[PDB]
């Protein structure tokens, strides 16, 4: 009657923020085989489901998300296990008697060295052709890593091509997707929806420029953890993607040297053709419209009438000062001083960048591991969409005058924050009690 009674309810729409173990999904594309193990991954539902939670307002937070911290390690653990059964090149740390490449600042070295054959007696006087950045002299040269860490050559049957990974949550959990067209990753979300799996994001690991990502809606989106703090990177997302074309015009040769029983190191043979360096092209017309479109969104945070300047990287390492990424199998390191050479106030071919290549790349954020990128045969040429920008701000003491922006970002989590800004993990608790004038039997 007037005295209500407790009544248990099962299957109530109640959730709280939590963290758990997310799993994968990767379509059913026919195939083979790559680094990011799309193999033992669960296929994607052919007809995905998305339920728009009407009237629901939820507070998201892209900077304190766990999917980013979880995907960051999954990719590292993916690259780790993929290199485990592959060749180890400890016999390659031998004195390299090098010389300039055959041409007419060399950027290449024709190095000869002794090498262990299949037998444990006679040696092998075989030559190779390593890049300038993968070899350092000593008073003759040596592989750059040898004083720092051991090396492991990637098997040439695995592919470095990123294919989409769908992150999902197990039973009892759900992932929420904020679907408003103007959202800076933090704060309450007006229009929210639930999904079991995120959309297919490709684990592209780039720097300065963010490639093959998703596009923002309407206006270009700007996201930062603390705009007033110049020690935090500012992630940018484009509405219209700029076209970028990279190529390595060097028809290389793959010399298959045999080291010991079974193992086989792949060297660089004689180059067929001209000695042309790698580069990337960006249309001057599109980049002039995109940079002017981002600075219009920057004035909404630093006064309406202010001056914004762009400059290249200052202090930094190699894999951060240069637009570092993978394009066809080789690892390019492109000079971005031609893209951030601008100065905007309050109100016809392409742009080429001198790219350099490394075969010995070091593990990001760890002490003693480096891998050998096997040489690719053929003139490499990839086409990509630059859809984002990792930018930093120089903390000038004379503030509120003119602000300068410089790129960077040698941390993979920013490459994952760029596509996990619209997702967060919650746990469903279906046990809910409620009062009503309902009593059971005697």
């Amino acid at each position, epitope marked *: 009657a007037e005295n209500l009674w407790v009544t248990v309810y099962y299957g109530v729409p109640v959730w709280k923020d939590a963290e758990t173990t997310l799993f994968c999904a990767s379509d059913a594309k026919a195939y083979k085989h790559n680094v990011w193990a799309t193999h033992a991954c669960v296929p994607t539902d052919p007809n995905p489901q998305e339920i728009h939670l009407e009237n629901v307002t939820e507070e998201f937070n892209m900077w304190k998300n766990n999917m980013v911290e979880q995907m960051h390690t999954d990719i590292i653990s993916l690259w780790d296990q993929s290199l485990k059964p592959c060749v180890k090149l400890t016999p390659l740390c031998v004195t390299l008697q090098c010389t300039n490449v*055959t041409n*007419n600042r060399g950027e290449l070295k024709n190095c000869s060295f002794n090498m262990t054959t299949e037998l444990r007696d006679k040696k092998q006087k075989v030559y190779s052709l390593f890049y300038r950045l993968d070899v350092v002299q000593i008073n003759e040269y040596r592989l750059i890593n040898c004083n720092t860490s051991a090396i492991t050559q990637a098997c040439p049957k695995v592919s470095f091509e990123p294919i989409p990974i769908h992150y999902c949550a197990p039973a009892g959990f759900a992932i929420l997707k904020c679907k408003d067209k103007k959202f800076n990753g933090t704060g309450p979300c007006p229009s929210v929806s639930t999904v079991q799996c995120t959309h297919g994001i490709k684990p592209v690991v780039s720097t300065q420029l963010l490639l093959n990502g998703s596009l923002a809606e309407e206006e270009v989106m700007i996201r930062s953890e603390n705009i007033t703090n110049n020690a935090k990177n500012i992630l940018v997302q484009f509405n219209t993607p700029v076209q970028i074309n990279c190529t390595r015009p060097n028809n290389n040769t793959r010399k298959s040297i045999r080291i010991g029983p079974g193992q086989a190191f792949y060297a660089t043979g004689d180059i*067929i*053709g*001209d*000695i*042309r*360096q790698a580069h990337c092209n960006v249309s001057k017309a599109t980049w002039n419209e995109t940079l002017g479109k981002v600075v219009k969104q920057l004035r909404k945070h630093f006064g309406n009438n202010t001056i914004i300047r762009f400059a290249n990287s200052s202090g930094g390492d190699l894999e951060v000062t240069t637009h570092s990424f993978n394009c066809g199998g080789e690892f390019f390191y492109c000079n971005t001083s031609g893209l951030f050479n601008s100065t905007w106030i309050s109100n016809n071919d392409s742009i080429t960048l*001198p790219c350099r290549i490394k075969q010995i790349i070091n593990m990001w954020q760890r002490i003693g591991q480096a891998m050998y990128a096997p040489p690719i045969q053929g003139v490499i040429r990839c086409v990509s969409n630059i859809t984002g920008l990792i930018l930093t701000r120089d903390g000038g003491s004379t503030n509120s005058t003119t602000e300068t922006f410089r790129p960077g970002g040698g941390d993979m989590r920013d490459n994952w924050r760029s596509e996990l800004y619209k997702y967060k993990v919650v746990k469903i608790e279906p046990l809910g009690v409620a009062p009503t004038r309902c009593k059971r039997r005697v």
Partner: antibody
Amino acid sequence: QVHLQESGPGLVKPSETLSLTCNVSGTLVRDNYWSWIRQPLGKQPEWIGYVHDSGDTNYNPSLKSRVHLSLDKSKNLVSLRLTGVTAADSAIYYCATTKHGRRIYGVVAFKEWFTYFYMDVWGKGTSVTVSS
Amino acid sequence: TFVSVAPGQTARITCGEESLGSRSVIWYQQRPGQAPSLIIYNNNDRPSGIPDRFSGSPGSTFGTTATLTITSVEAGDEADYYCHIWDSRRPTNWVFGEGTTLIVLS
């Protein structure tokens, strides 16, 4: 028409200095490039070096420290010098105009090209014998 | 080196080493007792006064020697043929390649 004529001594003692002259008729010595070519008997021709105004002059790396070219704009003729001659310098020295070219293979901006030359209008040629 | 071709046929002449990069081969013809003349500059580009019967191998092939093709062979073409190799991988050649004399038979 362009008529080039070489004229020199034709006989130079060993360890001396050769002095040749290419009398130009048909065009100016300033608005064109000039090159000298020698050829021993029964051998292939050998390039000696090109000469042009504004100090654009290069020498043969094998004959660098001995040859000295010049252009006489007031007299409209090409000159040549060769100090310290030996028996291997006995050849037929020619005089020819030179037209430059630019062969592009890369991306132009990265200096991925090279400048090639070719002589189109030769001369009648002079004969120079080295003996004591 | 001597190569002979029956009159009216097509002639082939090899000069210089094998190509290491993009080339711009210059061909010359030396009449016996006369001065050498320019035949084909820039691999396969003929100036004014040279018929289309002469064609050189393109300098876009990587791994082949400089080939000089002479269609419709006549007794007047019996002379020496030298080449000037301009290679992007090799330094400037100040000595012409060893020539090849064309012999008109019949």
